[PDB]
Design a protein around this ligand. Structure first.
Ligand SMILES: [Cl-]
Ligand SMILES: [Cl-]
Ligand SMILES: [Cl-]
Ligand code: NA
Ligand code: NA
Ligand code: NA
Lengths: 386, 404
């Protein structure tokens, strides 16, 4: 859904930074306080180069992992904008000189922080907020009647920099997608298909009874995000450490039981593709997850996958905004707002239309549409007959 | 080496807009007053799809061609920025702001104002020449007065003796100076319209790959190769003289453009511009289309090049060094496909007998195209932004060597 705050945040990013902007939108006003400059964010191990997991809050600042312990310098105000009925926003940034000074004056906390040890075990990546886009004044944005007030100084969007911590700490201002925080090539549709097909090949191999229970239990964990979140951490820690994993409760536990041995250690060939599939589902929105949990039959899933496959295949180059025409004749019912394939595509940030062209590609929509494609491909690959 | 201060302007654009392909950099502080919002700019008829002519100032505003005559609404201030990379014991920061004319302002102006019915004399002159008309829709200007110093890299004893104040120049930029701008092509006919989403195939007045670029230049060269050796040599030596005087080349271009779009007798010009015009014209005063069109293309390609690039070509007009420089540019362009991605190009062995360095003429010609050069493997760094000037440099070298 437009979520009111979610809709105003996307339009503000587009006006301030431009279409291919490197600004990440803030999910909610409650969480805004944790995305301030210098805040630390974690991300689960990146299983794919086409989709990335959402950033989570560590509720710690860069000073909390460095020595000597001291407050960070005040972020500089780069600029102000009148985004339009006029909302005033401003950019607070941590300069490169501030990072270089901090790297010279501060070193990693030598007896090692406990939170970093937890992230290292799960194979998570660590990031630091380098820039924020926040409101200057209080605005009363109105939405049914639901006036959402946004107070002054609210983080609407943010820029991150991956930090690499080992013997010394380093900040990646110019991002490198191949880098990992803790140390243990054309991006086209063809490479994306090969990556998902490699993961799908590992599935199918499993017995039809095993594939069906993993499939039905995925539909149950799609109802409970924290259940899926906990299962992901158990798999990530088991893959990065190789130790016995603690049994879980609910459908998360049932899926974990399928992927694990009599000793407690995960089977890497079974756990890795499931970790990829759960990571692709984590990228999707609540609405998208509840739709996939209903349409888990391989009949509708195959048609939805073919529509997403066509959208992605026709949107190359993925860096330009392009219009795509869809073969809606594939679907059993008419192409409208109530269609499940319309809702799955609209939740990816794609602007849809009733007819020719039906989809409007946005470069920003690559991360969720790759996750939706990989999710549909693997979920149909589980429910298929041998 | 910047184009006077172009590297500092490009750094400000990169920080403010994210990429270079959105805002056009202003050439000089003297001309800045003419690139303000609502100002009208003309661009000569586009002879090629790979290179585009520079925008010239009409020194008129949108209100000067519309009725009722009334001042334009004040442009809105979209935002302010504090840029610190202004060099290309403490750091240097400059405050800039963006002034924009909103789409609603343009739509309101289109509803309230119509074209000046007995027709503006300046529009008639641009129409006769086949020029395109544009309007400045957004500007990036300074908020405060900034003093930027320029440091000149050594320079030879002959270039210093030409002038003869030291290497460090104190340049003072006043508050409200236009550093960069965004344009919108306006289409004027029975009604006027503003193209906010640009269309490269559109003309104001209604009357791909390296292989396509090579074919376009080769077609132009085929026409020039049919001329007499004495006429080709006089056209070549006189091009080297008009390369010293930009306004002489600018006037000759307008005479050829108006003669091609109207087909009437052209008034004789003075200096080397006049000598070239005499070669392309009849006993009656009308241009020979087969002769004037390829020369118009060649002059348009030279107009895209910088002053430094033009002074280098005016010295190296012999077909000996010209052929080697053309081959280097041909290789850079051929290896940079696709042009949209930044790619590194490795230049082949024995570049010019002597050595590949900052003082090499081929290095300066390529660096003035926005290409970041390096002493060795890879020597060139392609930037998508460098397509317009490198196409013009290729076409210029190809046709100048084709002269003789
Ligand atoms: Cl987020
Ligand atoms: Cl892993
Ligand atoms: Cl210009
Ligand atoms: Na602070
Ligand atoms: Na089996
Ligand atoms: Na395509």
């Amino acid at each position: 859904m437009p979520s009111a705050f979610e809709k105003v945040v996307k339009n503000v990013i587009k006006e301030v930074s431009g279409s291919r902007g490197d600004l990440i939108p803030v999910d909610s006003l409650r969480n805004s306080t944790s995305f301030r400059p210098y805040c630390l964010l974690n991300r689960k191990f990146s299983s794919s180069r086409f989709w990335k997991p959402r950033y989570s809050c560590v509720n710690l600042s860069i000073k909390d992992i460095l020595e000597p312990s001291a407050p960070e310098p005040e972020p500089e105000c780069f600029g102000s904008f009148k985004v339009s009925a006029s909302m005033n926003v401003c950019i607070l940034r941590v300069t490169q000189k501030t990072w270089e000074t901090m790297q010279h004056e501060r070193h990693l906390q030598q007896p090692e922080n406990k939170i970093l040890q937890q992230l290292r075990s799960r194979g998570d990546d660590l990031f630091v907020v380098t820039e924020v886009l926040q409101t200057k004044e209080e605005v009363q944005i109105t939405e049914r009647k639901k006036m959402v007030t946004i107070p002054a100084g609210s983080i609407l969007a943010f820029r991150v920099a991956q930090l690499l911590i080992g013997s010394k700490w380093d900040i990646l201002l110019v991002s490198d997608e191949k880098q990992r925080t803790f140390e243990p090539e054309a991006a086209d549709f063809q490479g994306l298909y090969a990556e998902v097909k490699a993961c799908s090949s590992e599935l199918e191999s499993l017995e039809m009874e095993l594939r069906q229970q993993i499939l039905v239990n995925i539909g149950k964990i799609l109802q409970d995000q924290p259940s899926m979140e906990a299962l992901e951490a158990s798999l990530g820690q088991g893959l990065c450490s190789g130790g016995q994993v603690e049994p879980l409760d609910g459908p998360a536990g049932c899926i974990l039981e399928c992927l694990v041995l009599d000793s407690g250690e995960l089977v890497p060939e079974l756990a890795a593709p499931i970790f990829y599939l759960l990571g692709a589902l984590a990228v999707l929105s609540e609405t998208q997850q509840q739709l996939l949990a209903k349409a888990l039959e391989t009949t509708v899933l195959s048609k939805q996958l073919e529509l997403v496959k066509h959208v992605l295949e026709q949107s190359t180059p993925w860096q330009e905004q392009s219009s795509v025409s869809l073969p809606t004749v594939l679907l059993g019912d008419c192409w409208d707002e109530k269609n499940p394939t319309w809702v799955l595509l609209e939740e990816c940030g794609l602007r849809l239309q009733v007819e020719s062209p039906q989809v409007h590609w946005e470069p920003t929509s690559l991360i969720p549409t790759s996750a939706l494609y990989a999710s549909l491909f693997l979920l149909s690959s589980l429910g298929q007959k041998p």
